[PDB]
């Protein structure tokens, strides 16, 4: 960590200052003019001979590598060999010396989330605008649209916060200012909100699935009662594991604005409920596809396959079943190209999932097109 290295280096500098105060040479007028360099601390060596000094321990890698020592040669007059054609102390640090994929992923999901956000606000305006489209199904769709919009906004905000966390001015204060955006509480809440928005989007996809599976095969219910229960499941339930995750992050492992999952056990507080929602929604998807294929069988063979494919393709964005492909590929095990493919497919599909849902359930919807045609007909008359 940058922080720990900062205090290690400053304590090393304090030790160097103490050693210079208690200088081994009592100003013999023949010793080299020992100075406390910003990188390493060097004492006054024998005039006319080279002095080898072990590289400082505050370096993250040189701490476990004491073999590399920085050697400096001092003249009999207390000077050193000129460096870069200038009177600078000699230094040899070669003994202890030691992105594209993520940029492409960032570009891809930023573009996808922007398009999804725009299409989803347009779709929400369309669904809310037409009074004839107001129903429980469309209310749940509107809640899902809101969850997707909140997720996209949280992604934009957390990307901006990550940029601020490592701006040139931000790292400037890290070693001297000692106070920066990372120590601020607002950065923690940004990523807490991002986690909550992700969990709420997943649980609203689960609510979509559960409502469809109650419409099919689950008789009749108090519609006004279940809708409140569905809203509570979609929004409140993510608070039941995101907030304990925040408390755990605050008490233990409170560093880096809660951006790094150093302990996977604490990272299991959020992943497990999300995995449970994804699995239940995948089972719902399987059951719904079974019902659809039974309905198609009840009613040619080649047209059945096309209709089944169209229904399955349309149902995937509404339930988010594309996550099931790499859901069980755990973080701790994804490495190399497997991790890259998992992250790429997840980010690219989720970024465009809002756009696909908006198009499928607002724009190409038969009821919405009928409402538009009717509104156009009223304008002519």
């Amino acid at each position: 960590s940058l922080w720990e290295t900062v205090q290690k280096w400053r304590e090393y500098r304090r030790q160097c200052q103490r050693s210079l105060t208690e200088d081994p040479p009592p100003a013999t007028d023949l010793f080299c003019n020992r100075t406390f360099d910003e990188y390493a601390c060097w004492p006054d060596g024998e005039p006319g001979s080279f002095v080898n000094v072990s590289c400082p321990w505050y370096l993250p890698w040189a701490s476990s590598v004491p073999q590399g020592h920085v050697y400096r040669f001092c003249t009999a007059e207390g000077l050193w060999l000129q460096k870069d054609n200038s009177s600078l102390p000699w230094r040899d640090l070669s003994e202890c010396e030691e992105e594209e994929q993520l940029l492409f992923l960032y570009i891809i999901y930023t573009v996808g989330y922007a398009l999804s956000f725009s299409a989803l606000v347009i779709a929400s305006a369309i669904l809310l605008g037409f009074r004839h489209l107001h129903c429980t199904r469309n209310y749940i769709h509107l809640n899902l649209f809101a969850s997707f919009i909140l997720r996209a906004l949280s992604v934009f905000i957390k990307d901006a916060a990550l940029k601020w966390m490592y701006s040139t001015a931000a790292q400037q204060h890290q070693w001297d200012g000692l106070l920066s955006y990372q120590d601020s509480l607002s950065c923690r809440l940004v990523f807490l909100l991002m986690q909550y928005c992700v969990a709420a989007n997943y649980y609203w996809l689960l609510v979509e699935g559960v409502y469809l599976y109650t419409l099919l095969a689950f008789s009749v219910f108090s519609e006004q009662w279940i809708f409140r229960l569905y809203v509570s499941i979609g929004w409140g339930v993510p608070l039941l594991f995101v907030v304990p995750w925040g408390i755990v992050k605050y008490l233990y492992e409170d560093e880096g604005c809660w951006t790094r999952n150093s302990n996977m056990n604490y990272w299991l507080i959020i992943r497990l409920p999300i995995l449970f929602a994804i699995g239940v929604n995948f089972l719902i998807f399987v059951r719904v596809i079974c019902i659809v294929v039974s309905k198609l069988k009840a009613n040619c063979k080649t047209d059945i396959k096309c209709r089944l494919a169209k229904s399955t393709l349309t149902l995937i964005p509404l339930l988010g079943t594309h996550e099931v492909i790499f859901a069980f590929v755990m973080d701790e095990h994804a490495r190399g190209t497997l991790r890259f493919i998992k992250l790429f497919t997840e980010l690219s599909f989720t970024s465009f999932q809002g756009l696909m849902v908006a198009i499928l359930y607002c724009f190409v919807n038969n009821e919405v097109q009928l409402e538009f045609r009717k509104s156009w007909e009223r304008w002519r008359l």
């Binding site: 890290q174 951006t259 790094r260 992943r271 998992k342 992250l343 989720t350």
Partner: peptide, 29 residues
Amino acid sequence: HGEXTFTSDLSKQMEEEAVRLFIEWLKNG
């Protein structure tokens, strides 16, 4: 989920880059 993991990886990379650059800052002064 994907967002969490990607953000963690990016933050780790940025932390390492910042540490390396700070070490580079000490060399110049």
